[PDB]
Nucleic acid binder design. Structure first.
Ligand SMILES: Nc1ncnc2c1ncn2[C@@H]1O[C@H](COP(=O)(O)OP(=O)(O)O)[C@@H](O)[C@H]1O
Ligand SMILES: [Mg+2]
Ligand SMILES: [Zn+2]
Ligand SMILES: [Zn+2]
Lengths: 558, 623
DNA sequence: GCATGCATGCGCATGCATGCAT
DNA sequence: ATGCATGCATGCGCATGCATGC
């Protein structure tokens, strides 16, 4: 056992004597918190490591008590750093000022939240390995979010007004369900024995945002022959609206039970998210098949792009799709009928909190403003193909069935892989790439040497131009996507001609050709993407020439 | 005022009294200030109009209040519950001061509107509880009327005295002692001698159209009171101004324990129908305040010009090149035909609307036209291929959210009543789904007979359908019927069928390329007013000359279509012609149908199917 | 190319057993 | 001390999706 007063004093002096970062960060944070210019404060346990490390272990063992102690210490320290009144004060601030002008619960007057960030020395755990030994401790978990609930208010402190007196009664809430009061415990009513009845007030009461979310284990950490396990996380305060379904997240929190069996849950404190044509250096050749993927990732200025690759088996189309899925920030990958029907579009499901029905989207909905990858496209069902066509042409999905009447926005770019032409793919897709294989001794020897080098050294063969990591590519793409070039008026007189003659050539080759305004739109989109790659405000001729060359190369694949 | 507020009753009352007399806007134009002298104060004229008519309700714009001052606007937004009665009493005092001897039913009430529009409902916070909020959405469910008690009537068992109690704070305290015989617990409540008010529950579907990445649509619940009940219908797009509420949820009905998490709730105080982009609705068309005399004169002068018809076809969609015939057909559909009544004849309802089918290659702008029509016309619905089921349309069985009321729920087609339904990828639709359309396109009614439910619903809907050839290409060797592959019964119900083909003209390609590249670098209000005035004023009628012309056109059409390979003609087609003629009568603002309208309808029908270029004896089209 | 046989989720009401809040 | 709301099957009615057989 140990007295909490000494540790409270230690926390108070720590919050005031951490200049070793040169600006006094905590002084500024307290000033902003006192002037209502900041509503959240995070404490680093790595910062506490400079002080006595016993506090770190104590916090890791009894996190809630020390969180309350930190909150109390910050509340006591706030008056010292105050300099001025609130510039713009809201309804709650008006109530606080009026109450101070005229005991009150500490959380009622409090208007800030405190959270702990896990130490870097603390190794993250696994959802499967958190058990009774970790109950009440501070843990860090890495996982994937699958379900998120809507934001709703939750009571913190309830305020009651009496029928025959101006006294206000305050009731803290520490349970999922609470019993409202009836009689007035005020001293005036107690003396007079009037027996007045209390009435709840929504304005005086304090509310906080509340959210539910679910997390699952990564497929890498699953043991042999097992199935990933799920955990439930509660979100409150400013941490709300951070996590979204389909994201890989890391959450630091506390493991607590619910009432001799009990059910466990997690309370979140910190949630965090986890030439340039060098896509998949592991694959030899396909030099002209990689710039198209880069342009697809960059996108146009609707400016979406859809790409389909048809090829004989064994040319490794799937690896390119997997690399594209891994590289893109928001991406989804589909293999076939394992995610057909309900896997796409959306479905109606019960709520965890409200107890009513809400709509949860599929792969296409999750991939909104991202890139979707489809493998074995020819094997998909008719309904899925119609939905994909609707997404490609209209960018919205329309659902009208029993209990569902919705229009979902899906602004996603589709990359598809297929085996061996039907007119639908040519008329709908912007770019089709047909990959054919033929035996050549020199090319076979080169490919075999590259494959053997990859298998032996576990790394692609070195060359004059070294490739780049995924983080640098992502940052470069993010920087490139910022700008929006414009097509000059004069170049029209060029581009139109470049179109017309082309169609004339297509009219000469009556065997099998397809041209329309869609080809011109695709050329314009590719030219705009190429101009964006150069950060130029005005599209140049070289971008148009490169786009025309790429389109011709796509067309010349028989 | 209650503790925790800075609102002062007297100051707000004086400020509102001054504002009702001092506010003048010079930027206001006669385009919206109908029947009001702009030089004179506006709200005083509104009060005078109220006195003349007798409507006990006044509409006040929040933007005008903000323009006058910011303190009053902020106080009204923050604390509506205290501000609104002050405004009501100030308005009542001013009205009774200026206009003695007036006769009404109750005191005048004020309804604010056009507050700051929240971009998304999900962006709200508990800080916004009990504040004025404006929403835009579409109604999908409306419940029945619910009575809510306001006063309670009590009667004594022994002496039978009459007493009344008024509700305070939402709770009624029944007396425990009498007033004449002083007997304890001798008072009994009588429900039928009490006073009740109407309450209605409505459901909105939110669509701000600027949703973030991965956000699904939202459903909101609204509660309406008093005269606001039944002011909206399912499928209508409305703006709702009201208050935000939070209500606790009981753990169970018979235990007073409640959950810590509260339930969101919205109270409705104002409805708005007008939109800056969409056409006028049916509610506005039943009023005389829509059009000022100057605009009526301008529209009448414009209608006299001969080219205005074509001008309208030029102004329908400037973002799509040419396609004059398609735009003319869309305009004629928008105008519609005469809605005759055949109840005395026994024939039943007669379809006065036009259904249009467009067939062509996938590389065509038919989808753009469908999207533009859907976005432009109110009460419009959109479906795509197999995404909709036969049960998804019409209605389906669903229980009431509380009890077993067996509440039938409307579908896409029913929500399209008096509107437009667009269908894309009409080929993929199954025969079961087309079975519904078979009845809908002709009878304009839907008959539902399932377990415990037997009913008929109105389905006055006009359909725009899009279709494709077999191989996504128009094969010249195959005939039109072979390429389309649709049953003759289904095709016969379409008034106009537009076949879109590619002639591969160099000038056409150059023009299309120039227009597409230039895309990178008439007034709509005038069009809306003209369409509304034409649709809500004139009922065309046809004469003997039009009769003979229609008979000759019908016999000529039958002779032309007798040949195999082409789409055959049926008597139903004749009716279509009449409808088209009536539409033309609405274009020229003429109450009499002349031979010119019949000739134009015949020309449009002939050009739509490309019969002139089509070989009459082989069914192969070659320009 | 489509209607039907065979699971399966959804929403609901109804009946049998029991465990204790007013 | 007593009557009732709830947990746990089970029938009812329905729609939806996957497979196949003519
Ligand atoms: N050009 C290439 N360079 C290196 N390896 C290749 C190449 N083409 C094929 N491979 C190898 O052959 C295998 C093809 O398998 P897979 O990717 O499933 O083919 P597909 O995607 O065509 O079904 C891959 O594992 C890949 O390592
Ligand atoms: Mg593969
Ligand atoms: Zn009291
Ligand atoms: Zn009595």
């Amino acid at each position: 056992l140990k007295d909490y007063a000494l540790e409270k004093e230690k926390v108070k002096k720590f919050l005031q004597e951490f200049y070793q970062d040169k600006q006094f960060k905590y002084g500024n944070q307290l000033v902003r918190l006192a002037h209502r210019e900041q509503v959240a404060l995070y404490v680093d346990l790595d910062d506490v490591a400079e002080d006595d490390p016993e506090l770190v272990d104590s916090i890791c063992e009894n996190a809630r008590r020390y969180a309350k102690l930190f909150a109390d210490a910050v509340q006591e320290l706030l008056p010292q750093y105050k300099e001025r009144e609130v510039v713009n004060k809201d309804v709650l601030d008006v109530y606080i000022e009026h109450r101070l002008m005229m005991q009150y619960p500490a959380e009622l007057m409090r208007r800030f939240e405190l959270y702990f960030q896990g130490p870097s020395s603390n190794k993250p755990r696994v959802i499967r390995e958190v058990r009774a030994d970790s109950v009440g401790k501070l843990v860090t978990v890495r996982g994937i979010v699958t379900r998120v609930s809507e934001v709703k208010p939750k009571m913190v402190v309830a305020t009651y007004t009496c029928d025959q007196c101006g006294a206000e009664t305050y009731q803290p809430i520490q349970s999922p369900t609470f019993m409202p009061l009836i009689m007035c415990p005020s001293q005036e009513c107690q003396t007079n024995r009037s027996g007045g009845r209390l009435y709840l007030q929504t304005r005086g009461s304090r509310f906080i945002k509340f959210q539910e979310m679910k997390m699952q284990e990564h497929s890498d950490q699953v043991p042999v022959g097992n199935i990933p396990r799920s955990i439930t996380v509660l979100v409150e305060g400013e941490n709300t609206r951070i996590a979204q379904p389909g994201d890989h997240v890391s959450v630091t929190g506390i493991f607590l039970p619910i009432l001799l069996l009990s059910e466990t849950y997690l309370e979140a404190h910190r949630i965090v998210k986890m030439l340039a044509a060098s896509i998949a250096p592991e694959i030899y050749g396909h030099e002209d098949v990689k710039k198209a993927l880069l342009l697809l990732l960059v996108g146009g200025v609707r400016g979406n792009i859809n790409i389909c690759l048809m090829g004989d088996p064994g040319v490794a189309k799937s690896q390119l799709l997997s690399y594209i899925d891994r590289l893109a920030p928001r991406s989804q990958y589909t293999t076939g009928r394992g995610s057909s029907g309900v896997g796409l579009t959306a479905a109606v499901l019960r709520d965890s909190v409200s107890g009513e029905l809400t709509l949860e989207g599929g792969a296409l909905v999750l991939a909104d403003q991202g890139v979707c990858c489809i493998d074995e496209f020819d094997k998909m069902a008719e309904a899925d193909r119609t939905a994909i066509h609707e997404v490609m042409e209209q960018q919205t999905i329309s659902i009208a069935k029993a209990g569902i009447l919705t229009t979902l926005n899906a602004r996603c770019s589709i990359l598809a892989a297929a085996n061996p032409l039907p007119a639908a793919l040519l008329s709908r897709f912007d770019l089709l790439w047909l990959i054919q294989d033929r035996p050549d001794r020199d090319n076979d020897l080169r490919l075999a040497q590259h494959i053997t080098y990859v298998h032996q050294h576990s790394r692609q063969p070195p060359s004059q131009f070294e490739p780049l990591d995924m983080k640098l590519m992502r940052r470069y793409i993010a920087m490139c996507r910022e700008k929006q070039p414009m097509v000059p008026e004069s170049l029209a007189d060029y581009i139109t001609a470049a179109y017309v003659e082309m169609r004339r050539e297509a009219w000469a080759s009556k065997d099998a050709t397809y041209t329309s305004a869609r080809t011109l739109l695709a050329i314009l989109r590719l030219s705009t993407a190429l101009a964006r790659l150069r950060m130029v405000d005005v599209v140049e001729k070289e971008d148009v020439n490169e786009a025309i060359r790429l389109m011709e190369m796509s067309k010349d694949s028989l | 005022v209650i503790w925790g507020t800075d609102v002062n009753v007297a100051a707000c009352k004086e400020n509102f009294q001054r504002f009702l007399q001092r506010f003048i806007d010079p930027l206001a134009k006669e385009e919206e200030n109908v029947g009001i002298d702009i030089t004179e104060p506006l709200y005083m004229q509104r009060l005078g109009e109220i006195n003349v008519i007798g409507e006990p309700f006044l509409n006040v714009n929040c933007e005008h209040i903000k323009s006058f001052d910011k303190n009053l606007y902020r106080q009204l937004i923050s604390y509506p519950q205290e501000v609104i009665p002050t405004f009501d009493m100030a308005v009542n005092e001013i009205f009774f001061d200026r206009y003695p001897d007036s006769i009404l039913e109750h005191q005048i009430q004020v309804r604010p509107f056009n507050a700051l529009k929240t971009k998304n409902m999900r962006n709200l916070n508990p800080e916004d509880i009990d504040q004025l909020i404006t929403i835009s959405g579409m109604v999908i469910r409306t419940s029945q009327l619910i009575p809510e008690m306001q006063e309670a009537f009590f009667q004594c068992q022994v002496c039978a005295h009459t007493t009344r109690v008024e509700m305070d704070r939402g709770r009624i305290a029944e007396p425990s002692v009498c007033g004449r015989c002083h007997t304890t617990h001798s008072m009994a409540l009588i429900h039928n001698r009490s006073l009740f008010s109407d309450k209605q529950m409505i459901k909105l579907q939110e669509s701000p159209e600027d949703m973030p990445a991965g956000q699904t649509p939202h459903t909101v619940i609204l509660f309406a009171h008093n005269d606001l009940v039944d002011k909206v219908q399912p499928g209508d797009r409305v703006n709702v101004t009201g208050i935000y509420r939070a209500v606790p949820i009981r753990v169970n009905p018979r235990v007073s324990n409640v959950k810590s998490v509260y339930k969101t709730h919205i109270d409705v105080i104002h409805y708005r129908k007008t939109d800056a982009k969409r056409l006028h609705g049916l509610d506005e068309e039943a009023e005389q305040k829509l059009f000022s005399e100057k605009r009526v004169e301008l529209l009448k002068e414009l209608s006299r010009k001969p080219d205005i018809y074509e001008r309208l076809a030029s102004a329908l969609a400037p973002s799509i090149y040419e396609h004059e015939d398609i735009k003319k057909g869309i305009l004629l559909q928008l105008f519609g035909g005469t809605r005759k009544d055949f109840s005395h004849t026994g024939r039943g309802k007669f379809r006065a609307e036009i259904n249009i089918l467009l067939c062509g290659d996938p590389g065509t702008s038919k989808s753009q036209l469908l999207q533009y029509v859907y976005n432009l016309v109110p009460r419009g619905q959109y479906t795509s291929g197999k995404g909709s089921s036969a049960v998804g349309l019409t209605a389906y069985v669903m229980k009431d959210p509380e009890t077993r009321q067996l509440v039938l729920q409307t579908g896409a087609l029913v929500l399209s009543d008096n509107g437009i339904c667009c269908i894309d990828e009409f080929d993929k639709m199954n025969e079961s789904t087309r079975s519904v359309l078979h009845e809908v396109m002709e009878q304009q009614t839907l008959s539902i007979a399932k377990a415990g439910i037997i009913c008929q619903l109105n389905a006055r809907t006009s359909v725009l359908a899009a279709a494709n050839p077999i191989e996504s290409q128009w094969n010249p060797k195959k005939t039109t019927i072979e390429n389309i592959q649709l049953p003759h019964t289904l095709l016969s119900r379409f008034d106009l069928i537009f076949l879109m083909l590619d002639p591969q003209d160099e000038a056409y390609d150059r023009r299309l390329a120039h227009h597409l590249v230039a895309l990178y670098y008439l007034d709509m209000a005038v069009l809306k007013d003209y369409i509304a005035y034409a649709h809500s004023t004139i009922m065309p009628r046809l004469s003997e000359e039009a009769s003979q012309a229609l008979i000759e056109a019908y016999v000529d059409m039958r002779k032309i279509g007798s040949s195999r390979g082409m789409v055959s003609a049926y008597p139903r087609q004749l009716e279509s012609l009449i409808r088209l003629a009536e539409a033309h009568a609405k274009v020229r603002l003429s109450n009499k149908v002349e031979a010119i309208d019949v000739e134009e309808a015949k020309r449009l029908h002939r050009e739509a199917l490309k019969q002139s270029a089509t070989d009459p004896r082989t069914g192969i089209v070659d320009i």
